[PDB]
Ligand binder design. Sequence first.
Ligand SMILES: O=C(O)CCC(=O)C(=O)O
Ligand SMILES: O=C(O)CCC(=O)C(=O)O
Ligand SMILES: [Mn+2]
Ligand SMILES: [Mn+2]
Lengths: 318, 317
Amino acid sequence: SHMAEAALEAVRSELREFPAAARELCVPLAVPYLDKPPTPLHFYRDWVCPNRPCIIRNALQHWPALQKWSLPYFRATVGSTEVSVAVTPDGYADAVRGDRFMMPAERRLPLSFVLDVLEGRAQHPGVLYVQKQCSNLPSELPQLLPDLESHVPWASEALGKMPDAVNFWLGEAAAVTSLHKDHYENLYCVVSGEKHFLFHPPSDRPFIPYELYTPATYQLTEEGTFKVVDEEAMEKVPWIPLDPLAPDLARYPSYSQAQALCCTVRAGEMLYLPALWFHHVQQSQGCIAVNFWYDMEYDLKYSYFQLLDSLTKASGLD
Amino acid sequence: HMAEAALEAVRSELREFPAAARELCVPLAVPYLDKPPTPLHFYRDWVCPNRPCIIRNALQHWPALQKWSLPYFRATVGSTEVSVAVTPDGYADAVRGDRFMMPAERRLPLSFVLDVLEGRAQHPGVLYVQKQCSNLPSELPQLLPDLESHVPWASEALGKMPDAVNFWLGEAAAVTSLHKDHYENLYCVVSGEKHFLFHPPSDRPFIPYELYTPATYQLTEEGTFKVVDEEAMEKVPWIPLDPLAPDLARYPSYSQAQALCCTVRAGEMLYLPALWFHHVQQSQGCIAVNFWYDMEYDLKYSYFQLLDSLTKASGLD
Ligand SMILES: O=C(O)CCC(=O)C(=O)O
Ligand SMILES: O=C(O)CCC(=O)C(=O)O
Ligand SMILES: [Mn+2]
Ligand SMILES: [Mn+2]
């Protein structure tokens, strides 16, 4: 029917207009800074409920980590501790490589070897990143807990809950985190160096491509090479093929209608990365960071994003 | 071919969304709070999730709660002239036949309104003090010292003072038809009771809307009502359906919506969240006050706009 076709083009048109309408109301042109930690209520009303990012300054002054932490300090304090290390040939763990979703090779290594690689004292095949997540800071590096807080009190009070995980990040500058989103409210604390975040708001979903990929894992051979081993037990994983830094607009032309939001988080600063926001992460050499993950609330904003996601696919936009 | 399959997929998702959203975000019964919440709790537990609740013991400081009554009004502000909505049948701002009917507005001394409520005097049609536009401070200023000009914990939570404070005093036949407001509403019943039927905003795909030419009631000298079309008025979208007696032959999809009902009693305060569809019935001479805070125009608002546009665009409305 011709009337049916007109209704579908009106739907597709509304979906395509939504990211611009939403960003005009809800999304800042630049990530704003706070000069000091907000009150819990201010945090909930100004940032959490509206689901929008900010960087908080002067929130890590109680952390001994801010003065002490460095690669030599780590060597002295936890250098012999065994940690899960992610390894990839090119620095892209959990990323689309060709026709597969590639997961990294996980290797258990003393932290001193990571420090050696980062300081150029040693050579290793590929790119190293201590990225395990899964609350790896209390689990693998408990000796470091005295150097920081077990949670961000004003944020825990605001969200009415405690952190579900506290993660330690340490990697080469070549280790890049490709575009993805999380089901968590994220307080990302850069202790040393700098992180470069590229964001897309949830409302850009109509212009963010997703594809289904066979999952596979890198395997490091004794000869210093990387094998691709398929994960037969996993179902195909949906992932964003697109590289926000050099997007393949010939394949995904509609991505040009998305709009990226960029910011840099420096030592001493805390990024609030709101739940469901797409993000892509780069780092300076041996950047040290800690992030607190608080579980998001499964509320109206979550239901709406599920609708937006489903409609993006049902309508043919993705 | 492909277009018809993509459209029914889209339509199916829109039809499935009200159940998914309510099963996750909408209570089966309006919850009660034993006492006023803290601002943070109010915002986190009710405002941000866009969830209604009834607060008990929130007006016990109000002198109005011990003093207000029709006889107290008679003695205190009886001679005061107030704006009164008059309709033949008690449905102001409602779809009647093929028109959106606006009430006849009359300036009457409160005494007379009180006589009508008490059966002392008769009057054609149905009266309702329902001007809104912050009519309490505007028309009954003498009553202000009997209550707070705002709800402090709610103003702190929302970071702003109320945009309006309204006084409500009507007959039992004066019914408010289904509609939604872009305000956070703290609705306070001082005397009598109010019966609220709700639909959450996510029921929009199943709530019918139509465009109506607007008209107004004129009370004749003969004691009857005429309809005067508002020729210089753009048409007004409104919900043709009575949620309590829905016309399921005309709007069958409305059976897929799910209403949520509650009663608010003297001394109780209802938080009616922004964009929630509500229909209101009252007891004869019910006395109520409500505080309107403009809503925040954030992601939740943008999502509802998209849901609203897609409902029309897909042909579900
Ligand atoms: O720091 C990174 O490389 C990625 C961080 C991230 O994605 C997260 O904290 O959710
Ligand atoms: O009390 C009534 O009759 C209607 C109340 C209402 O619609 C409101 O307070 O927004
Ligand atoms: Mn992440
Ligand atoms: Mn209303």
